[PDB]
């Protein structure tokens, strides 16, 4: 009967908890007690991007981290030259309710998706003067919350159907479905190696996935509420997780557990985007507050606040060169800080 | 400026002109979220309103009095709505259709309405409450086989409002049922509302040709109430 399996699941859950407690020989707060604080990390809106009509739901930097895609629910992807406040493209979407976008690391392609369960992929290097939709990946049975390119031809796509899927864009077909999530999958971050990725759901859990083996390598479950946002630490051995529970939490893969929790009783609202800085020492959490907070990822104190937005910081991305943190909001504005 | 830099400025200005054109098309298009349970006849209202003209969102677009409306029948999402519904924090209205007939399911519709209304982001979004299937409600109350007091015991003591309009010369008991169902959602909206958004109750059937006219009148009154608050006249 099912009760035997439920009991064995409880047994393995207790075993996992005991093993995690047996690895918890220290906490990062204690180990970070010996190293100097990062101080007041003030930063200023160097560039503000006025182009969108409606709220920005998602934003993502290119590899040569100058171009910036931004996706708004007026049905535009705008690509910005952040150095010049200059629109290099503006892509009209087949469905306004876009919720995710990414660059291909090659720069050649830009993806988006949303309430229409498709991942619309747009080729920027077409010979024509305007961008064309090169594939529309349509197999998901729920809205797409995050699409991230593994390469010029592979894209991984989290959906509210509780699954992620890895697509071959030339085939237009799911190579792998990642099926273990019980809740609406909300956020996806690739490891720097792109061999692993982690996705946070509306289960209070994050799952680590192997893109080759097609399997859930680990599950991280210290959160209380929906993990709206997830971001690998640049070492690739840890990742941060923003939630409706107003906490960020940093999970280390090899310790298989919460290494740190970032929280402040003045904050009673969810995190909607998360990014690390290039050293990993700053954790940048976009709150619904509508402020936007910098945490010392190691010390877990508030280094500073990017208090420039009047509505949710829906998206937050640090350049691959680390030179700026872009922030985007339901204000329709992207503000770029350093 | 360099030739490439000037050329980039020229392309950005072309894009800006197109964005200004799309701005006017966007601002002149009034977006609507159509919500309702499987019972609630939502599809029949989309199909009727199309006379005014596998995927995760169905856009039915219609025009009344040269006003363009985009109405989004959300479909084939999962039943966890707390994340996708955040998108519609900028629609003019939520058309919440309700099967007014199946009193057993009506409490689910009440809790769905309460979740829409209390939600931090929909906190500015008015709800066009289509109490649908009024023909079947009338049949059910006139047949008397089923008894609202068993599902909503406060109906044992609720008395028909002085604003009540038994339009087709319908029975007093049918009217009492109708306006009770109305006043449950009005109690939810009236108690918790902050005055930034309002509930627009309507009684309807699939056969109602006037449902586009109702949505026009409600969106008109919503934008009026929005501006009249902004001008501190209301």
């Amino acid at each position, epitope marked *: 009967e099912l009760d035997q399996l439920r009991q064995e699941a409880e047994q393995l859950k207790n075993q996992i908890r005991d093993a995690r407690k047996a690895c918890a020989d220290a906490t990062l707060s204690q180990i970070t007690n010996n190293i100097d604080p990062v101080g007041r990390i003030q930063m200023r809106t160097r560039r503000t991007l006025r182009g969108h009509l409606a709220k920005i739901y998602a934003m993502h930097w290119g590899t040569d981290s100058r171009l910036l895609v931004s996706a708004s629910q007026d049905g535009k992807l705008i690509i910005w030259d952040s150095y010049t406040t200059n629109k290099v493209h503006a892509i009209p979407l087949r469905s306004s309710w876009v919720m995710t976008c990414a660059y291909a690391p090659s720069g050649n392609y830009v993806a988006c998706g949303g309430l229409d369960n498709i991942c619309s992929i747009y080729n920027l290097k077409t010979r024509e003067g305007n961008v064309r939709v090169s594939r529309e990946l349509a197999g998901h049975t729920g809205y797409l919350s995050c699409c991230r390119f593994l390469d010029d031809n592979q894209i991984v796509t989290s959906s509210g159907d509780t699954t992620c899927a890895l697509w071959d864009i030339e085939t237009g077909q799911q190579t792998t479905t990642f099926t273990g999530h019980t809740g609406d999958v909300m956020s996806l971050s690739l490891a720097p190696d792109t061999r692993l990725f982690v996705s946070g759901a509306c289960d209070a859990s994050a799952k680590l996935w192997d893109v080759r083996e097609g399997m859930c390598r680990q599950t991280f479950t210290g959160h*209380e509420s*929906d993990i709206n946002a997830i971001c690998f630490f640049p070492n690739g051995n840890a990742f941060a997780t923003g939630s409706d*529970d107003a906490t960020c939490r940093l999970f280390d893969l090899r310790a298989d557990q919460e290494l740190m929790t970032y929280s402040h009783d003045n904050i009673i609202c969810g995190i909607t985007s998360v990014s690390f800085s290039k050293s990993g020492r700053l954790l940048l959490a976009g709150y619904d507050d509508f402020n936007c907070n910098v945490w010392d990822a190691l010390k877990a104190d508030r280094a500073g606040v990017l208090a420039g937005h009047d509505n949710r910081v829906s998206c937050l991305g640090v350049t691959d060169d680390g030179m700026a943190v872009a922030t985007g909001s339901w204000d329709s504005f992207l503000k770029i800080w350093n | 400026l360099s030739a490439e830099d000037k050329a980039a400025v020229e392309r950005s200005k072309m894009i800006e002109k197109q964005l200004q054109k799309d701005k006017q098309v966007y601002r002149a298009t009034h977006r609507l979220l159509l919500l309702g349970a499987d019972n609630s006849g939502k599809s029949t209202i989309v199909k009727q309103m199309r006379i005014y003209h596998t995927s995760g969102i169905f856009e039915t677009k219609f025009q009344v009095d040269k006003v363009n409306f985009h109405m989004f029948d959300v479909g084939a999402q999962r039943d966890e709505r707390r994340k996708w519904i955040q998108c519609f924090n900028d629609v003019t209205a939520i058309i919440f259709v309700v099967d007014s007939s199946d009193y057993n399911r009506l409490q689910e519709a009440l809790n769905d309405f309460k979740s829409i209304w209390n939600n931090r982001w929909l906190r500015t979004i008015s709800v066009i409450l289509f109490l649908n299937k009024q023909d079947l409600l009338a049949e059910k109350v006139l047949a008397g086989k089923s008894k609202i007091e068993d599902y909503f015991p406060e109906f044992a003591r609720y008395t028909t409002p002085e604003d009540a309009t038994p339009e087709p010369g319908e029975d007093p008991r049918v009217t009492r049922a109708k306006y009770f169902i109305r006043d449950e959602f009005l109690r939810i909206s009236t108690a918790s509302g902050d005055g930034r958004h309002y509930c627009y109750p309507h009684f309807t059937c699939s056969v109602d040709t006037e449902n586009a006219r109702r949505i026009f009148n409600d969106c008109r009154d919503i934008i009026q109430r929005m501006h009249l608050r902004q001008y501190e006249l209301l």
Partner: nanobody
Amino acid sequence: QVQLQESGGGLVQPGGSLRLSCAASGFTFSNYKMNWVRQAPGKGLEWVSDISQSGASISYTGSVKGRFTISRDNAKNTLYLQMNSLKPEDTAVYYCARCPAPFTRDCFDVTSTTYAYRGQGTQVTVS
């Protein structure tokens, strides 16, 4: 880990009284609006009752409103439902369901067929 282990079900006579209990764990229980939900056999997830963070507000479905009382102890992290006058209509797997987000008034998805923040549930049966 968020868990909502629940106990107090069984079999009762019509007109009997029962006391469901839900040992919430893994979340800051005081911050969350707590719901009871039930699934009668072959039916949907009927919502049953709701209690605010402080308990200063409560709500019920009319099928139970005069009959069940929802209560919480925020130090024990226990949610309760006393069922003073059970009826054969009440036979269901009950589930304590937490609101999704803390400090929040909209209890979305608590009735959703798969929802993370809900117990495995207690069966109530009535003769």
